[PDB]
Amino acid sequence: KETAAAKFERQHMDSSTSAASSSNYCNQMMKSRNLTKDRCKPVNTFVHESLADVQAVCSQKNVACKNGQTNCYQSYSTMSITDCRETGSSKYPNCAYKTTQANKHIIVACEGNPYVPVHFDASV
């Protein structure tokens, strides 16, 4: 079955674009990445960087995860990201999101060997 590292790439990476180009970006990407298959996921962030730069965060600033775990890392640099949050008209299966583009540091949780990101914690 899908690994946790492959699932983080499917849910959070979009190296093919530099930034969201229109208000429809979240609607199209949440659907195409299959995140609205069983239900509408309420929030999700896409990161518009190369996978090598996001995997490198695992060896950057170790910080506590919002749930208290200590295998989280904060990127030293800000990154281009897109926040997708479910709107008031969202109704399964036609899930609807608001697209917000921003430049922030990201926080991920890492595991394994190679040690790579497997959960997107927060952006700050």
From Swiss-Prot:
Keyword set, alphabetical order? Disulfide bond, Endonuclease, Glycation, Glycoprotein, Hydrolase, Lyase, Nuclease, Secreted, Signal
What is the recorded phenotype of mutating residue 12 to A? Loss of activity
Give all cystine bridges in this chain. Answer: 26-84, 40-95, 58-110, 65-72
GO cellular component, alphabetical, reads: extracellular region
In its keyword annotation, does this UniProt entry include Cytoplasm? no
Active site residues according to the UniProt entry = 12 (proton acceptor), 119 (proton donor)
Quick one: where is this thing mainly located?
Answer: secreted
Protein name per Swiss-Prot or TrEMBL: Ribonuclease pancreatic
- What is the scientific name of the source organism? Bos taurus
Covered residues of the complete protein? 27 to 150 of 150
